[PDB]
């Protein structure tokens, strides 16, 4: 929530924010506040089995939310409904491309560099956005 580009720090402002590593077991853990146990109160000597039933149901709603419905839009999708991008002010994703960056090695050829190599990665790529209709004034930003 920085208010001005001037509230950003050296690195961020010049290179952009940092993003998440590709997903793996250690970089895609369940949200840190994930419940590991759900307590349910009980009268000194008895337990309301009907309440216990509700308790679970309630928990279920809580979990679903924590695990994958943390964003309003996703909760509404949960019900089988939908939301315009104006509903939560989300930028509209118009096109997403992804590709691997490969290249070649350069062979060292002098007395000491003979048998050495330097990797030069150089990948060509196309990123094409199909004719899009702009309903209101604004910006079309493309990032990498």
């Amino acid at each position: 929530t920085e208010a001005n580009p001037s509230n950003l720090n050296e690195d961020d402002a010049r290179y952009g924010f940092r993003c998440c590593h590709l997903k793996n077991i250690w970089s895609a853990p369940l949200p840190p506040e994930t419940k590991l146990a759900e307590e349910m109160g009980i009268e000194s000597n008895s337990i309301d089995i009907m309440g216990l039933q509700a308790a679970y149901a309630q928990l279920h709603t809580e979990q679903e939310r924590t695990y994958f419905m943390q964003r309003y839009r996703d909760v509404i999708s949960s019900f089988g409904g939908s939301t315009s991008y104006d509903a939560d002010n989300r930028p509209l994703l118009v096109m997403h491309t992804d590709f691997w960056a490969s290249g070649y090695d350069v062979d060292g050829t002098d007395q000491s560099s003979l048998g050495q190599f330097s990797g030069r990665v150089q990948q060509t790529f196309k990123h094409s956005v199909p004719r899009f209709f702009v309903p209101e004034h604004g910006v079309m930003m493309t990032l990498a």
């Binding site: 993003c19 998440c20 590709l22 997903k23 895609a28 853990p29 369940l30 949200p31 924590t66 695990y67 994958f68 419905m69 943390q70 964003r71 996703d74 691997w100 490969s102």
Partner: peptide, 24 residues
């Protein structure tokens, strides 16, 4: 030696990562 440079996608199978929502 094309695939050998790029770590697999693990696209086969079901969903593994629940992290609260969509994360690029």
């Amino acid at each position: 030696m094309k695939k050998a440079r790029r770590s697999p996608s693990r696209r086969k199978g079901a969903r593994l990562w629940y992290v609260g929502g969509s994360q690029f």
